[PDB]
């Protein structure tokens, strides 16, 4: 499928941007704004951020499959969200260009109703959010210390942070070989109305970030998942995967072993029809499932990942496209699972982590 217009080299981390006029790839000329250019580029591609950045010299590094340079308008950069809008072709005489080490995500490092037991390392971003010893929600690692989950996982009775734990790196709930860390803060969306009024039926903005008290080490069993790239659309009909330890049947018990299930994305036109959810699928929400039912997420899966794989970055990567949010029962025909549309919260995520980088406690954020 069509490649993303912003790319990063796996060989030396050089940033490469597509020039639609030539159909070529160009390097980014080094400037005093390298730090932010690197950051924006990583965010644009679906990575959480740039860990570090550096300069490369074409005279010793080569062009490696590029034809020329792009220069960043450092006057327009501060007031833009899209890198492509502030770049123009330039000579870049000294031949120094930008390299950026974005935080790797979405790749395995190994050598739910109607789903099946999964195996270690297959979904290394999946975490279990437990309160006072009970698994209540899933979550997805965006880094070693930040987890994306659902805001509804934090009702009034589950807000004492010292009583929450994040279990990673294992698929069996009772495994003593995983890692379980504490929680420093929970940044929930201020637009999630039921947070202040549990009786509210308006579930839009069901999303929250969990900052662990310390970072988890990245291993073959613990890895962050990527985010949709800027402008990357959710494709109707595409089959993605949802995972979790939730009930294996609505009236059944939670899974002892993490479950995985494949479900296709359903269009809003169909899902908002009377036979389905009857105008209940609001903006920033989407359905995934089968008209026949049988395979779906369920209670205990909320906050968990709905991931789709793609190769737009020149290598297969899994991206967090939805967050398990709600549904009417579980696995019922014409009552698919409803998910928070992650792409609609990209900026909310990037800014929340920046604004509340070291905050503590429950924090609201619009």
């Amino acid at each position: 499928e069509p490649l993303y217009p912003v790319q990063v080299s796996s060989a030396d981390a050089r940033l490469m941007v597509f020039d639609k006029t030539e159909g070529t790839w160009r390097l980014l000329c080094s400037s005093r704004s390298n730090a932010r250019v690197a950051g924006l580029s990583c965010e644009e591609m679906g990575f959480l951020r740039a860990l570090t950045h550096s300069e490369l010299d074409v005279r010793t590094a080569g062009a490696a499959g590029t034809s020329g340079f792009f220069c960043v308008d450092e006057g327009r950069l501060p007031h833009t969200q899209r890198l492509l809008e502030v770049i123009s072709v330039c000579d870049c005489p000294r031949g120094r260009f930008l390299a950026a080490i974005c935080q790797d995500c979405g790749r395995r490092k190994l050598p739910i109703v109607g789903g099946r037991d999964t195996s270690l390392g297959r979904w290394p971003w999946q975490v279990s959010l437990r309160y006072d010893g009970a698994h209540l929600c899933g979550g997805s690692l965006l880094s070693g210390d930040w987890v994306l989950t659902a805001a509804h996982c934090f009702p009034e009775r589950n807000r004492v942070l010292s009583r929450w734990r994040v279990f990673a790196g294992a698929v069996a709930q009772a495994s003593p070989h995983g890692l379980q860390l504490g929680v420093q803060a929970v940044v929930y969306h201020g637009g999630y109305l039921p947070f202040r009024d549990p009786n509210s039926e308006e579930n839009s903005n069901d999303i929250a970030l969990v900052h662990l008290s310390s970072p988890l080490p990245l291993t073959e069993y613990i890895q962050p998942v990527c985010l949709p790239a800027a402008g990357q659309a959710l494709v109707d009909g595409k089959i993605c995967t949802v995972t979790g330890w939730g009930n294996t049947q609505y009236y059944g018990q939670q899974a002892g072993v993490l479950q995985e299930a494949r479900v296709p994305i359903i269009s809003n036109d169909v899902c908002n029809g009377a036979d389905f959810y009857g105008n209940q699928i609001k903006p920033k929400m989407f359905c995934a499932g089968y008209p026949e039912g049988g395979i779906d997420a369920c209670q205990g899966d909320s906050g968990g990942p709905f991931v789709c794989e793609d190769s737009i970055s020149r290598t297969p990567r899994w991206r967090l496209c939805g967050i398990v949010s709600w549904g009417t029962g579980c696995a019922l025909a014409q009552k698919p699972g409803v998910y928070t549309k992650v792409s609609d919260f990209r900026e909310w995520i990037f800014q929340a982590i920046k604004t509340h980088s070291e905050a503590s406690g429950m924090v609201t954020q619009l």
Binding site: P194, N203, Q299, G300, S302, V324, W326, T328, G337
Partner: peptide, 4 residues
């Protein structure tokens, strides 16, 4: 319409 039940939350998960």
């Amino acid at each position: 319409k039940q939350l998960r």
